[PDB]
Ligand binder design. Structure first.
Ligand SMILES: [Mg+2]
Ligand SMILES: [Mg+2]
Ligand SMILES: [Mg+2]
Ligand SMILES: [Mg+2]
Lengths: 231, 240, 195, 244, 233, 222, 218, 235, 204
């Protein structure tokens, strides 16, 4: 009310309203799902269009050969944060000849988003990210929120009506976690998960966006006729 | 450094600081630009509430940017000096690097760009000035007349007016100016410019300034008596 | 760049400047005009390091032309020469100084007098009846000391100047490919096409 | 952050006016009146000191009239402290010009630069403008004797006779009435004093409440002299014109 | 632009079937003066890497501090710091190699020759060289300073190419290194008798041996050498 | 005084065929009269069917390759995974080299691959970025030995048709991958005989539309 | 190492526009680094630049010039003048003066307002307009043939040959020039390439047909 | 007052949303993409008859293979075009090739959100960026001040955008010829424009692989206007 | 390439009974080449006189600089600067350029308007003050001037006698120096009158 003019102000109950309003931008964004087994990690994203004449907004971004994310909210902010991740992944490779750990990736995003919530003039990031990757400790899935809070998970979903997919994954936890050495079945589980967040619309060929990374699989994105298999 | 965003959007999609800068232009003394077949004429109002003035030394309303281009304006007098100075420097800088004087379009585009930069830079307000820029491109005999405004938009005009009561004189020019046949001579162009100012000015004494620009850096400012002859001629023809 | 001369007479200033541009063992050009018009009644010749000369000359020219437009008024030769000297005086203590020597010939319209200023690359200004830069002086100065009179006409000045060029052409080691002569007077600046 | 406390000094009103410039002019309108009158053979500067106290040291005082160089002077109307900042800048600019061109600075050039500085404070920087209006009285070999004025907006104009500060409306009418082009300095002196004497908010105009200066060619042959009047000299010129 | 003051001489090393061996004497020379005798020029990083450094000792101590700090930094927010995300020899080398080249590029080098010996997580032997110029190379045998001229020839008789590595045992490899250290004591005027030796094995891990001495030297024949040509007594 | 440059020796060679291109280079690394490594590869696959070598000062060579490899990576990110053409790569490298015009990479750079018409392409660079496409280029320590042999055997220079009174030249034609490798191997065995900084091993990288293949051959180790 | 320093280049104005002719050799000391060097940079379809001195300096900055010319005509909706184009380059190298740039170049073009125009630009800041220019180690040799045979009223055919013959003259005598001759003809509607001519074959062809080079046995 | 980069309770940036209102006030611009080329057309909208309409430059060249049309506060577009032209030429300098239309659009869109308390406010202008490259062929992009860009088969922006977009929805198909697209832009412009459409108050342009980006003459557009009127009266 | 001896020139100052004298040659050359015989080296700011030898560009620059500073001094102080104060100003200004100095040998001369005391002073190029009762010397013939002044000078000379002594000191010193001469000027300075005399000397 009187305490939402900028990010530097606390409310009487101890809330940061600008951070919460940034969180609200994610809820308006299109749904995206993340889930992993022990061998692979999968991102599934429902793309959104302006109208029938327009293209579908690309949700998934590659960060390295072994890491990448999906976005929900302000796409330009995801571009800034993904670009930062690309550089950090790259710094780790050039300097230490070392693939960046997915956990450190999360820590770096948390610290970058945090600085924007404590200083005058700036604003919080208006986007949520689901980072998947495969490093020296196996497959990983992270959930980034622009408050700074990063969380490692087996599965999750963010965006509009994400609660449906999140409930499904919470039920299916024991099943999909053991889908080891089988990419197409892990994707199917992710496609069935995101389907629990659909209303009136269904998954078409230029609507669905899938990405995967794993043990002997570089981070690769599938769009267009390549995702027709999973409809 | 002072950073404040002074020029910003409002709910209805307007930038009030730019629009309030236009109000300053509307307050300013009237300025008119008319281009003929082989010349351009810049007319300018001077308010007569100021007697005991020294017209020798008082800043003239029409300013030379280069030997072939001139700039008149309406709005804040102090602001206009900053735009004129920058334009004059750019005019010499263009000659230095391109080995050729600026075109009237280029000089206008530069001045308009400066005005625009002040509409989305921190710590600054827009220029409370609109300009009429006129002249002849190097080795060219086609007359040029351009207008700029605080927002930064610019465009070419067969004839145009800015300042206070400019809507009245624009009404006059819109019916009196023929596109198919512009003022063929210098006399015809000056007369039409004086006529248009006489709709608004008051008296045709030391209230009207006229500057005539012709091809190949041929610019001259008319004196009181010379202008007064046009005023005397128009009034006698009017009584009919 | 090598030979630049200047002679102030009764009613005008005459500048003579060599036409040759040599680089290595080749004369690349034999019709080079080593001068810039700073204002209608002010002319500057120049000689020195390659590139620096023209870059400096045009920079000064631009600045004076900017002044002319701003004030709608022509600066006096004395005022221009002082501005030029200061620019060189700054330059000498810079990271990379302008290695340019100049002569400034002008006609002061307020005084109705011709004026010749000699300024070297250090910023050393002197007003003279006749001047030169480089090795040119070593021949001409003594010749001018003898033949020069303060009340000479423009035509007498050109004959005196011919005498200098002849001496240079006889005793100078390098072929400087003649000179471009220019006159500065009450009516402005004009070039002598046949010299 | 600090946005909360920003007055926004450099913005437009809905009507297209600069709030702070207008309010600065309102400030200046309460300042002691200063008059400048330009004659054919010189210039007069007259100014009224702000409500003097009897224990004020009058002879070793300077409030209104300041010297910029040998050929140019100014009369001040507004905050004295603000004016001195600008005066020192103007004095330096005049010396820079002399150093560069070996010629005394033309009056207009000095006036323009000082007016450009004031303009800057209205367009950028977020600072309050200088609450000062000047009357510039000076000479050069181009235009001869010149009078100018500048105000917090940074706009300057040339004049034959002009007033700034308090009661300028009444003062400008009286000057417009009695001024003529073939006027001499001694006549202009009398007009300047008569105008202040009628527009003053004081009971009677006296020597101790005035600052006076002339710029004549009254020196020996083709050279300009600046005369900042002493207390006793103002007392004499006030008796000579029949005011006291 | 530097000049090295307190200096360390040869660092020698080689690969064998299960790991790598590295050695360097304990001397800190001050020109011709053999100033300091208790200088350790082999610095372990974790339990799987040893960095051997020759050249300027002040710069060596700086590199020690960097490596010490690297271990600390790696442990931050790293639950697998003593497991999968532990520092590898290749990581440690590439870091140093980056620093060495950046410093030479700023015309302010770390005046050293460095050999990073270790064993990777997958059991692979790691042995690579870097110096003040940022120059890097790898070989079955690596040596610095005089070691390059005298040790490498001897070590290459054992492991001449890649295929000789599985055929070389830790006993044979250590023998060649200790022998090389003796030869360097005979012939390098800025060497000491006392040295340290380190073995990094993929099975038995890191074995760090301190206070070793050159022994079984041949000096007896000196008594028979008289004069410089014609002298008989 | 500290000298920031050094000479790591070695020599490289690039030859372009009709539908292929090879980029060879010996595996010896040296300083002064000492051998540092008998197998230190300096010909690298950089992706997008581009092979590269920066012979001379290895520290600058490795820095440059590393930076170009990185450039290829960021070209994919910024331009929707577009393939970097050999001509585009060349121009990019010019800017990398010239970027350090006043503190150069002391290296003779050569890249090889296929142009956009599928034909074999070799580009060569000086230390400060001047580049040119050629059928043939040797670089490094023994370039002066190998290059005139290449002029004679690849481009058939100074060879005229027998009996034509030296009037008709020997006609230019593309060489087979077999014939090119023969010329590479003979060029390096010859260079090894007469240049002390050349030897130990020869590594060739062959680039066709199918990908990047490698071949290795022993060289004299003295 | 030493870096490439490929030179003989000329360019002259005549009735039919401009001829540009260059050799092809690049050297590193006595070592002939390349016989196939392109010493004419095609800045754009209307402008040409010549390469002498630093090979990299000339290449890098004259393609950079082509970028500045393209940006000019996008903003001004008009072809850039040869005067302006040359001055963009000369002002740039003047900023780098002292740093060690090495450039001897002819900026050649043909516009409506100027006609055929040639500007010699130099790494020490020199910018000269002229009718005939000749730059490189073999420039003096090429000047001798040019000066004795040049006329304004040469035909496009004869002018092309004169430029070709002047390079040949330099290629013969100057040890650091040769390889092949590249010819260009600049018109108002753009430059036209007139082929690569190997000096080895051109010398014997010219010797026989012209009767020249009697000193040499053939 | 309030911060420039402030979020609303609904999760939108106030200043970005307000700039979108400014764009609705702007003159209409339409773009249609076909397999034979992309067409760009704009409403000039002269504020007075004395204004020389040919000086109204709302269609602009970025490179030979990329064109641009604008709508809104058109003065704000100048620096966006300047950046686009520099980005396009700079990429050619670094990579000896044409730059992809998408990459060009992305570079422009990176400027969009570089505002706050960088420039003081978002851009008050939307751009239609049309072009061709070898990879994705003929393309039309809509670049907003939010930093977002959508590719479109056809798109209208400005005051008559929602009405024109609904018309483009029905009329567009994947087999449109260039000539058909030209007429379609003129047809839809004439519907939404206030004043009567002619060659002086409306401007056409296109970009083809063969001839590159071209702004049509007033003579050429006039014939297409006459051809359009005849075809509508013919049934 | 020795800045202090490219252009050449000399200045000398002396005191007398209730008066001071300062004198300088008129030569400006470029090493061997004589360029100007009108180059005066003495300037004045109010009643304070400053002579400057050395590199001519700096001589000109410093004159313009001290004119600049003495003008602002007068405007703020509402009085003319005195010799003692000016001396300090010259020293301050020179030492400000300690590690990039003006290549000059300045010499202050004048009479204090309050006390009436004759005052002279000399400086090195970095502003060290050399105060003296008798005389100050400067320029490319300083050695010669030192020798002339030390033998010819006597205290409490009348203005007319002092003129002869300083003139003979300068002339004979200048004639033993190649880079000095080509005319000479002498300023005789009394409390409220100043006479300036051009000397006839050999023109080689
Ligand atoms: Mg050997
Ligand atoms: Mg030859
Ligand atoms: Mg003498
Ligand atoms: Mg003599």
């Amino acid at each position: 009310n009187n305490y939402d003019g900028d990010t530097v102000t606390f409310s009487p109950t101890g809330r940061l309203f600008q951070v919460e309003y940034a969180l609200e931008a994610i809820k308006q964004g299109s749904v995206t799902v993340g889930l992993r087994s022990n061998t692979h990690a999968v991102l599934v994203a429902l793309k959104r269009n302006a109208d029938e004449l327009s293209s579908y907004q690309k949700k998934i971004i590659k960060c390295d050969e072994h890491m990448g994310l999906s976005l929900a909210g302000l796409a330009p902010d995801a571009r800034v944060l993904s670009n930062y991740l690309r550089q950090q992944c790259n710094y780790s490779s050039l300097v230490f000849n070392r693939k960046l750990a997915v956990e450190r990736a999360g820590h770096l995003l948390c610290d970058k988003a945090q600085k924007n919530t404590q200083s005058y003039g700036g604003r919080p990031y208006g986007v949520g990210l689901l980072i998947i990757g495969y490093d020296k400790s196996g497959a990983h899935l992270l959930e980034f929120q622009p408050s700074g809070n990063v969380t490692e998970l087996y599965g999750t979903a963010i965006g509009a009506r994400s609660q449906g997919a999140k409930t499904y994954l919470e039920r299916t936890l024991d099943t999909f976690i053991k889908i080891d050495g089988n990419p197409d079945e892990l994707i199917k589980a992710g496609v069935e998960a995101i389907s629990q967040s659909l209303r009136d619309e269904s998954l078409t060929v230029d609507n669905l966006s899938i990405a995967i990374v794993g043990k002997d699989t570089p981070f690769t994105i599938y769009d267009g006729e390549a995702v027709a298999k999973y409809i | 450094g002072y950073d404040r965003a002074l020029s910003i959007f409002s709910p209805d999609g307007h930038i009030f600081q730019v629009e309030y800068a236009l109000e300053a232009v509307k307050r300013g003394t009237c300025a008119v630009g008319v281009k003929g077949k082989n010349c351009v004429v810049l007319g300018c109002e001077r308010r007569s509430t100021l007697k005991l003035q020294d017209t020798r030394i008082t800043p003239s309303k029409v300013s030379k940017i280069d030997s072939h281009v001139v700039l008149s304006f309406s709005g804040l007098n102090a602001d206009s000096r900053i735009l004129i100075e920058k334009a004059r420097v750019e005019a010499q800088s263009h000659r230095l690097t391109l080995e050729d004087p600026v075109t009237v379009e280029y000089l206008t585009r530069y001045v308009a760009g400066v005005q625009q930069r002040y509409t989305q830079s921190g710590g600054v307000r827009p220029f409370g000035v609109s300009t009429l820029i006129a002249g002849f491109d190097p080795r060219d005999d086609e007359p040029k007349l351009y207008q700029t405004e605080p927002s930064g938009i610019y465009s070419s005009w067969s004839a145009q007016t800015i300042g206070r009561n400019s809507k009245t004189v624009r009404e006059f020019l819109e019916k009196n100016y023929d596109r198919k046949e512009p003022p063929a001579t210098v006399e015809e162009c000056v007369k039409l410019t004086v006529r248009s100012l006489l709709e608004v000015v008051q008296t045709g004494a030391k209230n009207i300034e006229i500057t005539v620009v012709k091809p190949d850096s041929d610019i001259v400012a008319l004196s009181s008596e010379e202008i007064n002859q046009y005023v005397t001629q128009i009034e006698q023809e009017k009584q009919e | 760049m090598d030979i630049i001369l200047g002679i102030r007479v009764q009613d005008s200033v005459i500048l003579a400047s060599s036409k040759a541009v040599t680089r290595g063992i080749s004369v690349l050009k034999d019709s080079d005009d080593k001068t810039r018009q700073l204002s209608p009644h002010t002319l500057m010749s120049f000689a020195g390091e390659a590139g620096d000369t023209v870059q400096f000359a045009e920079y000064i020219q631009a600045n004076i032309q900017l002044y002319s437009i701003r004030e709608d008024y022509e600066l006096s030769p004395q005022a221009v020469s002082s501005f030029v000297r200061q620019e060189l005086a700054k330059s000498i203590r810079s990271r990379r100084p302008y290695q340019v020597n100049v002569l400034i010939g002008g006609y002061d319209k307020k005084k109705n007098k011709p004026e010749l200023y000699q300024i070297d690359y250090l910023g050393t200004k002197v007003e003279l009846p006749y001047g030169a830069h480089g090795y040119s002086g070593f021949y001409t100065f003594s010749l001018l000391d003898h033949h020069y009179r303060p009340d000479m006409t423009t035509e007498e000045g050109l004959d005196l100047l011919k005498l200098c060029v002849q001496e240079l052409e006889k005793r100078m080691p390098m072929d400087f490919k003649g000179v471009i002569v220019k006159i500065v007077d009450k009516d402005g600046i004009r070039q002598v096409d046949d010299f | 952050g600090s946005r909360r406390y920003d007055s926004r000094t450099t913005i437009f009103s809905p009507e297209g006016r600069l709030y702070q410039v207008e309010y600065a002019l309102e400030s200046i309108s309460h300042a002691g009146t200063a008059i400048g009158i330009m004659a054919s053979d010189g210039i007069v500067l007259a100014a009224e000191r702000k409500v003097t106290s009897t224990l004020l040291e009058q002879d070793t005082s300077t409030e209104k009239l300041y010297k910029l160089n040998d050929k140019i002077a100014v009369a001040v109307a507004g905050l004295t402290a603000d004016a001195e900042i600008l005066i020192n800048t103007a004095r330096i600019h005049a010396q820079n010009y002399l150093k560069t061109y070996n010629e005394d600075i033309p009056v207009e050039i000095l006036v323009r630069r000082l007016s450009d500085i004031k303009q800057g404070y209205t367009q950028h920087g977020g600072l309050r403008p200088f609450g000062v209006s000047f009357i510039y009285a000076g000479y050069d070999d181009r235009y001869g004797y010149q009078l100018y004025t500048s105000n917090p907006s940074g706009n300057y104009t040339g004049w034959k006779a002009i007033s700034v500060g308090a009661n300028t409306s009444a003062a400008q009418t009286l000057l417009q009435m009695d001024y003529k082009d073939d006027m001499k300095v001694d006549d202009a002196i009398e007009l300047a004093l008569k105008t202040l004497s009628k527009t003053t908010d004081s009971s009677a105009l006296t020597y101790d409440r005035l600052e006076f200066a002339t710029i004549r060619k009254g020196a020996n042959d083709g050279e300009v002299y600046q005369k900042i009047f002493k207390p006793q000299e103002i007392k004499d010129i006030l008796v000579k014109t029949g005011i006291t | 632009t530097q000049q090295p003051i307190v200096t360390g001489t040869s660092v020698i090393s080689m690969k064998y079937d299960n790991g790598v061996i590295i050695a360097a004497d304990n001397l800190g020379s001050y020109g011709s003066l053999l100033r300091f005798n208790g200088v350790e020029r082999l610095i372990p990083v974790g339990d799987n890497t040893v960095v051997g450094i020759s050249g300027d000792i002040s710069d060596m101590q700086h590199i020690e501090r960097l490596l010490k700090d690297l271990v600390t930094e790696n442990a931050y927010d790293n639950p697998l710091a003593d497991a999968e995300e532990a520092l590898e020899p290749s990581y440690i080398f590439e870091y140093l190699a980056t620093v060495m080249y950046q410093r030479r590029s700023k015309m302010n080098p770390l005046w050293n020759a460095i050999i990073v010996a270790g064993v990777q997580s997958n059991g692979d032997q790691f042995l690579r060289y870097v110096n003040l110029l940022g120059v890097t190379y790898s070989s079955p045998t690596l040596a610095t300073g005089f070691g390059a001229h005298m040790a490498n020839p001897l070590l290459r008789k054992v492991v001449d190419r890649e295929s000789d590595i599985p055929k070389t045992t830790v006993q044979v490899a250590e023998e060649a290194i200790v022998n090389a250290m003796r030869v360097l004591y005979y012939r390098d005027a800025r060497s000491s008798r006392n040295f340290s030796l380190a073995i990094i094995d993929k099975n038995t891990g890191l074995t760090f041996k301190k206070n070793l001495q050159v022994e079984n030297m041949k000096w007896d024949f000196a008594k028979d050498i008289k004069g410089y040509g014609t002298q008989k007594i | 005084q500290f000298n920031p440059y050094g000479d790591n020796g070695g020599t490289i060679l690039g030859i372009a065929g009709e539908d292929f291109a090879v980029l060879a280079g010996d595996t010896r690394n040296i300083t002064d009269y000492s051998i540092n490594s008998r197998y230190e590869p300096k010909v690298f696959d950089c992706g997008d069917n581009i092979v590269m070598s920066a012979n001379g000062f290895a520290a600058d060579g490795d820095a440059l390759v590393k930076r170009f490899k990185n450039s290829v990576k960021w070209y994919h990110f910024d331009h929707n995974d577009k393939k970097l053409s050999i001509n585009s790569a060349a121009r990019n490298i010019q800017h990398l080299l010239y970027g350090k015009r006043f503190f150069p990479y002391y290296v003779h750079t050569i890249i090889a691959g296929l142009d956009e018409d599928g034909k074999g392409a070799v580009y060569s660079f000086d230390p400060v970025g001047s580049y040119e496409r050629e059928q043939c280029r040797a670089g490094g320590a023994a370039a002066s030995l190998i290059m005139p042999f290449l002029d004679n055997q690849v481009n058939f220079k100074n060879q005229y048709e027998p009996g034509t009174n030296g009037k008709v030249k020997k006609p230019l034609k593309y060489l087979s991958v077999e014939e090119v490798i023969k010329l590479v191997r003979d060029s390096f065995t010859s260079a090894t005989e007469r240049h002390i900084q050349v030897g130990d091993g020869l590594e060739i990288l062959i680039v066709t539309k199918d990908g990047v293949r490698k071949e290795f051959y022993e060289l004299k180790r003295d | 190492i030493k870096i490439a320093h490929g030179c003989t280049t000329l360019a002259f104005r005549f009735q039919g526009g401009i001829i540009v002719a260059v050799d092809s050799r690049a050297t590193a000391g006595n070592w002939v680094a390349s016989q196939t060097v392109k010493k004419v940079i095609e800045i754009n379809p209307f402008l040409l630049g010549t390469m002498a001195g630093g090979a990299a300096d000339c290449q890098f900055w004259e393609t950079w010039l082509g970028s500045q010319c393209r940006l000019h005509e996008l903003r001004e909706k008009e072809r850039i003048s040869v005067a302006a184009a040359s001055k963009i380059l000369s002002n740039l190298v003047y900023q780098y003066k002292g740093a060690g740039l090495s450039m001897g170049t002819m900026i050649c073009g043909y516009t409506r307002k100027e006609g055929p125009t040639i500007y010699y630009v130099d790494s020490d800041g020199t910018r000269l307009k002229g009718d005939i220019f000749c730059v490189g180690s073999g420039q003096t040799f090429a000047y001798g043939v040019l000066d004795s045979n040049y006329k304004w009223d040469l035909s496009v055919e004869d002018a092309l040959y004169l430029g070709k013959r002047s390079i040949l003259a330099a290629a013969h005598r100057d040890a650091y020039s040769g390889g092949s001759v590249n010819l260009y003809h600049v018109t108002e509607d753009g430059w036209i390439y007139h082929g690569n001519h190997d000096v080895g074959e051109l010398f014997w062809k010219v010797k026989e047909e012209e009767g020249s080079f009697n000193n040499v046995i053939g | 007052d309030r911060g420039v980069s402030t979020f609303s309770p609904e999760g939108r940036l106030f200043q970005v949303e307000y700039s979108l209102e400014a764009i609705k006030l702007g003159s209409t611009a339409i773009g249609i993409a076909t397999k034979e080329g992309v067409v760009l057309g704009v409403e000039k909208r002269a504020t007075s008859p004395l204004l020389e309409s040919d000086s109204i430059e709302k269609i602009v060249e970025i490179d030979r293979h990329i064109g641009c049309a604008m709508s809104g506060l058109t003065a704000d577009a100048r620096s966006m075009i300047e950046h686009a032209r520099t980005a396009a030429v700079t990429h050619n300098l670094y990579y000896d090739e044409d730059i992809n239309v998408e990459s060009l659009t992305q570079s422009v869109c990176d400027l969009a959100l570089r505002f706050g308390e960088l420039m003081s406010r978002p851009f008050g202008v939307a751009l239609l960026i049309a072009g061709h490259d070898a990879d994705d062929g003929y393309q039309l992009f809509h670049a907003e001040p939010s930093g977002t860009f959508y590719r479109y088969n056809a798109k209208a922006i400005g005051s008559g955008s929602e009405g024109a977009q609904a018309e483009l929805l029905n009329e567009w198909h994947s087999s449109l010829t260039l000539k058909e697209a030209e007429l379609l832009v003129l047809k839809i412009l004439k519907q939404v424009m206030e004043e009567k459409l002619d060659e002086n108050n409306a401007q056409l342009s296109c970009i083809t692989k063969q001839d590159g980006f071209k702004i049509y003459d007033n003579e050429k557009t006039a014939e297409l206007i006459k051809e359009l009127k005849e075809k509508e009266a013919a049934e | 390439s020795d800045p202090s001896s490219i252009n050449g020139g000399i200045v000398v100052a002396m005191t007398g009974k209730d008066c001071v004298a300062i004198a300088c040659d008129l030569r400006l050359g470029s090493q061997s080449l004589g360029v100007s015989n009108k180059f005066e080296k003495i300037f004045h700011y109010g009643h304070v006189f400053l002579g400057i030898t050395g590199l001519a560009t700096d001589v000109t620059t410093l004159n313009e600089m001290f004119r600049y500073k003495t003008n602002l001094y007068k405007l703020k102080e509402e009085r003319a600067i005195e010799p003692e104060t000016f001396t300090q100003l010259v020293s301050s200004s020179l030492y400000e350029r300690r590690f990039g100095p003006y290549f000059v040998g300045p010499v202050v001369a004048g009479i204090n308007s309050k006390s009436g005391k004759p005052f002279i002073a000399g400086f090195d190029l970095i502003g060290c003050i050399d105060e003296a009762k008798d005389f100050i010397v400067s320029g490319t013939a300083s050695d010669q001037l030192f020798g002339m002044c030390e033998s010819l000078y006597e205290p409490n000379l009348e203005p007319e006698d002092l003129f002869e002594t300083i003139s003979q000191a300068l002339l004979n010193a200048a004639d033993r120096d190649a880079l000095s001469g080509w005319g000479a000027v002498v300023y005789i300075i009394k409390k409220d009158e100043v006479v300036k005399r051009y000397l006839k000397m050999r023109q080689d």
